[PDB]
Design a protein around this ligand. Structure first.
Ligand SMILES: Nc1nc2c(ncn2[C@@H]2O[C@H](COP(=O)(O)OP(=O)(O)O)[C@@H](O)[C@H]2O)c(=O)[nH]1
Ligand SMILES: Nc1nc2c(ncn2[C@@H]2O[C@H](COP(=O)(O)OP(=O)(O)O)[C@@H](O)[C@H]2O)c(=O)[nH]1
Ligand SMILES: [Cl-]
Ligand SMILES: [Cl-]
Ligand SMILES: [Cl-]
Ligand SMILES: [Cl-]
Lengths: 175, 175
């Protein structure tokens, strides 16, 4: 790779409650819900980043096809359907719950073996007052050659930037 | 469409017992098992058709990424993972079991609404001595603008031809 595509399959992965549905809602509808429900059925959405909005107009309109595992990450025989053929993996944890970091690390290791993914590790819920050490997390991401970003779905902080960073990386690769 | 791709996601769909795992085994390993087991985990395989083996060498090497639903077609919240982003759908029934035809028709209707698929309706098990009327089935496929083929995983009849027909259709579209 990288072959240029009409859209880029992107797995949105993380333990329940870390804020995946909230990242999608904030991203796509500029809205946040303090209370959320369990997902009914498969969870998909699309999002377009145009990098010029120095980039080649043909390559730099990047469309994400986001698959939110939304609970299916529990099932070892179902989750590969989310990974297969994905260009990007967004692995989310909650800064206030260290257990969710531990699971994210396990997923990063699985993904690195599975295929070549552009992986972004997302520290969500930074608006809250930390069970993790961010510096350790940043070091972790460097050691594993991951993109890293700190976000709040609640305030909107760095939500679009998740996909800006991914799109920059896809372009760099296509180029 | 059609955008040229490094591989073409292909959903292999049909009621249990119609012969999906057998089509894959015959296709990929030139082998048939008279007895088969329930599938453990997600079921994927790849297959390449080279159309020159009058065609443009760049476009005519067609790689299929085959996702066998392998039992998951029962689950309405799981099956969309198989359909989403698929270029082709292979909908298989068993000529000796009309119930499997009725289900295949329901799936064709769902797929036609879901997205633009190249759909091939496969009449498997033709080696057996028919609960269906082939002419009705051929008429059905014409009315719904489907590719149609009669196959035996047991003897190997027309198994490779499923993918020859699909590859011809993908090329026609890319062109
Ligand atoms: N304070 C805060 N709460 C959040 C944030 N993102 C999600 N939540 C809350 O966390 C809970 C779980 O969110 P949800 O989107 O359902 O997580 P998912 O299971 O990973 O999809 C909900 O109560 C959300 O309102 C955030 O960035 N900050
Ligand atoms: N006679 C005959 N038997 C077949 C054929 N294809 C599959 N079978 C048998 O049908 C049964 C179900 O096959 P399988 O591949 O497991 O079907 P699946 O559930 O759709 O994946 C097995 O006993 C196979 O040996 C065929 O073309 N002819
Ligand atoms: Cl909160
Ligand atoms: Cl909700
Ligand atoms: Cl038989
Ligand atoms: Cl088997």
């Amino acid at each position: 790779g990288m072959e240029k595509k009409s859209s880029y399959k992107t797995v949105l992965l993380g333990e329940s409650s870390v804020g995946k549905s909230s990242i999608v809602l904030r991203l796509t509808k500029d809205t946040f819900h303090e209370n959320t429900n369990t997902t009914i059925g498969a969870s998909f959405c699309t999002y377009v980043v145009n990098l010029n909005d120095n980039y080649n107009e043909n390559l730099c309109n990047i469309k994400f096809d986001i698959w939110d595992t939304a609970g299916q990450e529990r099932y070892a025989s179902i989750v590969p359907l989310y990974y297969r053929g994905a260009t990007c993996a967004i692995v989310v944890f909650d800064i206030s719950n260290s257990n969710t970091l531990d699971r994210a690390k396990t997923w990063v290791n699985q993904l690195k073996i599975s295929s070549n993914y552009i992986i972004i590790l997302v520290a969500n819920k930074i608006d809250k007052n930390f069970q993790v050490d961010i510096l350790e997390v940043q070091k972790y991401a460097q050691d594993n050659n991951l993109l890293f970003i700190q976000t709040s779905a609640k305030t909107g902080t760095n939500i679009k930037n998740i996909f800006y960073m991914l799109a920059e990386e896809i372009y760099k690769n296509i180029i």
